[PDB]
Amino acid sequence: MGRQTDISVSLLKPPFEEIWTQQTATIVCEIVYSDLENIKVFWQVNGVERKKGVETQNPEWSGSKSTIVSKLKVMASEWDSGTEYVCLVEDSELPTPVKASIRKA
């Protein structure tokens, strides 16, 4: 009963050196959804739309569930500055846009 809209937003943060944080690998938004129309992916960095280096990978299909993943190529010092990286998903079948931000931890 119910739950036609599974929308699962999981962000993957870049691995670090050891104790201190100073390395860039990827800032990723993985989103799982089904029954949707062509999704629009959005990333916001400090309120500013980010330059390419954002890459949405071709839809993955598991069962009836779809998975879209987007990786951001970013500067380590930006990331280490505690700069905001947030993923929003926009779709015509959605009632409101969905968002999730990542923190340097």
Domain at 56, CATH number:
2.60.40.10
Nearest to 88 by CA among 7, 5, 34: 7
Number of independent structural domains in the chain: 1
Residue with tokens 């990786």: 71
Cβ atoms within 10 Å, residue 2: 4
Residues 6+ apart with CB under 8 A from 7: 31, 32, 33, 89, 94, 98
What residues make up the domain containing 57? 1-105
Distance of alpha carbon 46 from the chain centroid: 15
Chain breaks in the chain (C to N over 2.5 A) after: none
The strand pair at 27-33 and 54-62 is best described as unpaired
- Experiment used for this model: NMR
Q: CA-to-CA distance for 44 and 28, rounded, in angstroms?
A: 12
